Design a protein around this nucleic acid. Structure first.
Length: 360
RNA sequence: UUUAAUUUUC
């Protein structure tokens, strides 16, 4: 191997490890390169900063930003976009809108991605009419709205129940010549399904030839289970081909079948999951722990939760919130014992976590 | 190197 390894090799390696998901491996290269005479650059800082935001170490991300500036490695548009996205997705919207101000004070033009990144945050922050302002502002600066832009607004409008305006934006997109893709059509197929418009969802799935992927089939499967067509969704899972089901496919059906009472069927799909080399994440165990609790069967729910940690999947706010619920409803001290444990392990409690225990 | 879609606690 060793030709002098560049910065670009360490930058490829560090990104690769960041996604994913051995972040601790990544940062020891970052050290190992600086001790070797190889100086990290703007892209080396941006990689790690995005790695650390995805792994939810946002506060540790801004440490590295501080460190770049100190070094006189200037943060560029990308560094700022990584930060603006990371802050939105950790719920720091107004922090993120600060950096949007600061970018311009430093002579950095905001981007197509910067506007996309912020229109997304705005939409997900229940602020649609600000999202549509930022969309008016790109055009004012002739930054061409693209397929990620339109797909985001459409998602936005659907998730606010504003379905017939999403449809109206999909039309506009095409006559304006930005072509939809699998993600466009599959947000819309998410829309229509969530508005009880299953026929319409399937009629959009027919899409030019955009090849549906596993997400579009998970949309329809979830659409079918919620509408109570469990065997039409077991059919589509068969299916109407070449798409390998993944972990969400099984969770969606595991939930559908739990809700229905078909706990036999579900658990065999959960047993089938692992035979086919699809590891059960935190949501598979969540979905069942709920099903078992609400079916009155709190013993087996707890079995599953112990087994969770016999395996490697670490619990969740949902895990604890669900068991908290079921434990209290199962006629308190243990519910409260789970709550202490949730604080030691490192998970932060949410409103419901509080709302339940209290309401003692 | 950075942005959009589907699953679990209603």
């Amino acid at each position: 191997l060793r030709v002098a390894p560049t910065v670009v090799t360490y930058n490829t390696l560090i990104d690769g490890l960041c996604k994913a998901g051995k972040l601790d491996e990544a940062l020891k290269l970052f050290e190992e390169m600086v001790e070797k005479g190889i100086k990290p650059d703007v892209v080396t800082y941006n990689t790690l900063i995005d790695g650390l935001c995805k792994a939810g170490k946002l506060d540790e991300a801004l440490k590295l930003f501080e460190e770049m500036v100190e070094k006189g490695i200037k943060p560029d548009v990308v560094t700022y976009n990584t930060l603006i996205d990371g802050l939105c997705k950790a719920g720091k919207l107004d922090e993120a809108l600060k950096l949007f101000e600061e970018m311009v004070e430093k002579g950095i033009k905001p981007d197509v991605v910067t506007y996309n990144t912020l229109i997304d945050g705005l939409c997900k922050a229940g602020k649609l009419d600000e999202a549509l302002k930022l969309f008016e502002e790109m055009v004012e600066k002739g930054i061409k709205p693209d397929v990620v832009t339109y797909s985001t607004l459409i998602d936005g409008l659907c998730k606010a129940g504003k379905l017939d305006e999403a449809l109206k934006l999909f039309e506009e997109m095409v006559e304006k010549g930005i072509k939809p893709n699998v993600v466009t059509y599959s947000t819309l197929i998410d829309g229509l399904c969530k508005a009880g418009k299953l026929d319409e969802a399937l009629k959009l799935f027919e899409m030019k030839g955009i090849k549906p992927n596993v997400v579009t089939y998970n949309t329809l499967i979830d659409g079918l289970c919620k509408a109570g067509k469990l065997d039409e969704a077991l059919k589509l899972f068969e299916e109407m081909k070449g798409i390998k089901p993944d972990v969400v496919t099984y969770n969606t059906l595991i939930d559908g079948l739990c809700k229905a009472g078909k706990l036999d069927e579900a658990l065999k799909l959960f047993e089938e999951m692992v035979e086919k080399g699809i590891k059960p994440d935190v949501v598979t165990y969540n979905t069942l722990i709920d099903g078992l609790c609400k079916a009155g069967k709190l013993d087996e729910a707890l079995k599953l939760f112990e087994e969770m940690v016999e395996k490697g999947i670490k619990p969740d706010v949902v895990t604890y919130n669900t068991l908290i619920d079921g434990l209290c409803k199962a006629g308190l001290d243990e519910a409260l014992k789970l709550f202490e444990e949730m604080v030691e392990k490192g998970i932060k409690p949410d409103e419901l976590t509080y709302r339940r225990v209290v309401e003692y």
